[PDB]
Design a binder for this molecule. Sequence first.
Ligand SMILES: *[C@@H]1O[C@H](CO)[C@@H](O[C@@H]2O[C@H](CO)[C@@H](O[C@@H]3O[C@H](CO)[C@@H](O)[C@H](O)[C@@H]3O)[C@H](O)[C@H]2NC(C)=O)[C@H](O)[C@H]1NC(C)=O
Ligand SMILES: [Ca+2]
Length: 236
Amino acid sequence: TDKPILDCCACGTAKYRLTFYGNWSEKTHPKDYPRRANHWSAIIGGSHSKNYVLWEYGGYASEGVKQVAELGSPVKMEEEIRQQSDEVLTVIKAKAQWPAWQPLNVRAAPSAEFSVDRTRHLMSFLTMMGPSPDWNVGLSAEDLCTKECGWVQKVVQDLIPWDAGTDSGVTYESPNKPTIPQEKIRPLTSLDHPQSPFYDPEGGSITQVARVVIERIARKGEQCNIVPDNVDDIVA
Ligand SMILES: *[C@@H]1O[C@H](CO)[C@@H](O[C@@H]2O[C@H](CO)[C@@H](O[C@@H]3O[C@H](CO)[C@@H](O)[C@H](O)[C@@H]3O)[C@H](O)[C@H]2NC(C)=O)[C@H](O)[C@H]1NC(C)=O
Ligand SMILES: [Ca+2]
């Protein structure tokens, strides 16, 4: 058996800003909106290698993912991430948001910086939509390395909630109801359950609840991109 070939051919390191924009408010998602309790939990994630999976669709929630989903607590997730030692480059953290939605002139969108290198060229994170039985948003294994042996300049992604598979409640404020055995992580849909706040008998996509912006802010070290990248962001 040979070691698998390297998937990322970019050189040196790159630094990114992750900014998280909530779009989940009583105005955009009126049905049973939790007017008093609504929040986003702290953001937790990391830049990492292919050898570590924080969460993935069709995967089972780790203990740390479960505690984010149910408690809004990033503490066990952060322990799990740090236990991966060299498979993780940067630990990503940003603060909780109470209430969940404000205009940008009122409150800055939470952000964090992270680094990538040839081996830790992926990024994952999650945050809990609260209150909820077990509903998060996030990205899993977003790749910052390009085929051209460079580093992506900007990624913009709109998000819908996903279900961590650990609690069977049907709406934001449902009583605790352990899902046993735990089920696979899956996205929410507009036909999950008639009491779901996202239910629409006509089906169709769920209105996005957040947008994430990932922007490159620096590169370091000799570069080996096969197309020009003359952005003046290489630090000496
Ligand atoms: C979810 O929240 C995000 C963050 O506020 C929203 O993104 C922002 O949306 C507006 C579009 O109305 C963007 O401003 C506009 O940009 C275009 C540039 O092409 C310009 O022509 C307009 O005059 C205006 O300046 C803004 O760039 C964008 N912010 C981002 C991406 O960070 C998003 O629309 C929200 N979605 C919903 C459905 O509420
Ligand atoms: Ca669930």
